[PDB]
Symmetry: C3
Subunit: 221 residues, 3 copies
């Protein structure tokens, strides 16, 4: 399938973006700046790793459904499993948040990725959609604590902090909305948009969120 | 098997108890109160999720043993894997504990659930019992740091704190004792009590611990 | 295979070393000393658990490669998955480190064990070596933050602290270097050194690192 030219493209970028933040953060003496550079460079590194497994083949196993065996891309749920909490912990660290607030976000996020995978590998039943919906519920709570909650706290900060968070939250809500759209439309969902294109859309939102988020946040607060 | 009318019953309650703490905690402005509401609502939510997987079928795979294939309910070990550390972290957060104390509890608890699963899915050998015993050892240490350790620290607090912890520890030790009893007696163990009843007993202790713990603790400290 | 007399030997020692730190730490009233005893006794306990699974057989599954099915010892990647971050968190706790510093070490370590396993269970392709190399990269970063980074901070402490860290870092860098050597030379890698001997080498470095590290650090700071 031509999807290899999208995995190949991704592994290239994610790996480069990792090598990029790796050399930029080599100077950070400051603790807080050192900290943000920690999360932000940890998320792209993982993306590369999984994208390699995805391309090489390890992260691809045929799963029954209906009457035919379909191309499951479970490695995506491994990337997302860690990559995601780190990105949320990132924002909450910036916009000084509560242990209750961060522990719950990452809690509902963990339900977001896990519930998602469960339905991604559901035996064969069209019960997949039910899990999709549970993930939707979860993601709705996530973008609520993010949007409305944090912004208020973003007003307790200097213009830089309120600004970076502004763009970051924007990018974060928008990108995280397109994900479940690409999922339902493609493989795991119906099959309307083929895997080739689905894998491109996901690779696009993936390179977008993780590297964009890095470049925008990394811009000195 | 009639066990579906126990999974169905559970998923109903766990999910409702989740929706309940979800609406009660919407008002918590205070940080500490916000925090406890975080753990306490995170544990029931997970229980529901897994109970759905349990009912729908995902969390049920046939495993060899002796000469016949048996009904393994591994999803229980996924629920317990997270649900448990959160409940211990809960109590230790109330009765102000040490990083050494909490990190070790959750450490021995993680050995409690993992060792448990290993023997729950042991190939076919009657080596299952050995793992059971290791879990017993682990759980003994757990109820020791809980009972004797924390109570002493419960005396350094206001009557509310010493009180809630009192009932909470009571409920926690009692319920956590019945669990390994139901395990040895049923499926994974001998087969004395059928799965139908075992699944009821587990669903009872499950709805009991998680929702009861929530209602009792949630009662303002 | 005679490798059972190495797993048996290991499970014996690891379990004993666990029982040893368990009785020594029963007196620690001090918080910090209590804390270090927490990590240090948690790592050996896990080693025993997995070594039992390794011996009994659970942690051994035949995997295709080339044309013949090979003896994969995945349980090692379960031990290492947790045992390792705990040992690094240990050193960083001693030589007062940053959240950025500890979160990144444990981050690159998690990539160390995961990437390692991925290639340990790679379908059959000689793509195993590529993952080996990624692990090498990861481990290189790890021993860099350890060696050069921490030592500088080791100079901000009393002679005891600078001393224990000295020996600990020595033992840690040396032992962690022999590991990937034993891996490439044996099973997962080429097949030069048989599993019998490989399992001995690994059991030696395992009993060495975890119990030695414990004895040396546990020596009052
Ligand atoms: C091979 C050799 C490699 C390992 C070299 C890399 C070195 C690296 C840049 C470390 C630099 O030093 C850490 C700096 C802060 O130094 P800082 O402490 O401020 O210096 C002054 C005080 O220490 C003392 O005080 P005084 O000066 O007065 O004496 O920033 C710390 C920044 C981190 C928080 C960055 C987070 C990223 C995360 C680790 C990515 C994971 C990547 C890995 C899987 C590795 C991948 C390898 C592959 C790509 C091949
Ligand atoms: C769809 C729409 C949904 C998302 C709406 C839900 C909103 C929810 C109640 C959030 C309320 O606000 C958070 C409050 C504290 O507000 P608080 O900060 O005190 O307000 C004042 C200062 O912010 C500023 O100061 P000032 O007023 O002076 O300006 O409590 C915080 C309490 C948490 C700690 C609760 C923990 C539970 C955990 C998150 C459960 C997981 C559940 C998920 C998987 C979601 C499931 C969805 C399904 C059931 C369908
Ligand atoms: C069966 C019975 C067993 C459980 C008994 C074991 C008890 C154990 C030693 C606990 C001792 O008390 C904890 C002490 C500190 O007491 P401390 O708080 O200083 O006392 C004074 C103040 O509390 C109050 O003040 P005041 O005196 O003024 O009133 O150290 C705390 C040390 C920890 C941090 C040790 C970390 C190791 C970790 C838990 C290993 C995991 C092992 C498990 C899986 C269990 C394995 C079981 C198998 C081997 C069979
Ligand atoms: C770097 C990668 C990021 C930020 C990935 C984020 C992924 C999601 C927010 C995924 C959400 C999903 C659902 C809500 C339901 C279907 C499954 C997912 C994972 C596509
Ligand atoms: C909400 C669920 C809770 C609090 C579940 C707790 C479960 C246990 C304490 C289980 C203990 C077990 C053993 C000691 C050995 C056999 C396996 C278990 C999981 C039944
Ligand atoms: C108690 C056990 C310890 C400290 C184990 C440490 C193991 C390692 C540092 C392993 C490193 C590896 C690689 C760099 C590549 C091949 C796979 C490993 C796990 C052998």
């Amino acid at each position: 399938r031509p999807e290899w030219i999208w995995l190949a493209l991704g592994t290239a970028l994610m790996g480069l973006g990792t090598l990029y933040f790796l050399v930029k953060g080599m100077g950070v003496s400051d603790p807080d700046a050192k900290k943000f550079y920690a999360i932000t460079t940890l998320v792209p590194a993982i993306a590369f790793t999984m994208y390699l497994s995805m391309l090489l083949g390890y992260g691809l196993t045929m799963v029954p459904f209906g009457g035919e065996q379909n191309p499951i891309y479970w490695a995506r749920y491994a990337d997302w499993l860690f990559t995601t909490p780190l990105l949320l912990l990132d924002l909450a660290l910036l916009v000084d948040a509560d242990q209750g607030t961060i522990l719950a976000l990452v809690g509902a996020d963990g339900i977001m990725i896990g519930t998602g995978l469960v339905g991604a590998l559901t035996k064969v039943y069209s019960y997949r959609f039910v899990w999709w919906a549970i993930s939707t519920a979860a993601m709705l709570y996530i973008l609520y604590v993010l949007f409305f909650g944090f912004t208020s706290k973003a007003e307790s900060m200097r213009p830089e902090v309120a600004s970076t968070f502004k763009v970051l939250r924007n990018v974060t809500v928008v990108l995280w909305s397109a994900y479940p759209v690409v999922w339902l439309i493609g493989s795991e969902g119906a099959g309307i948009v083929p895997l080739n294109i689905e894998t491109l859309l996901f690779m696009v939102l993936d390179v977008s969120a993780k590297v964009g988020f890095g470049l925008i946040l990394l811009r000195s607060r």
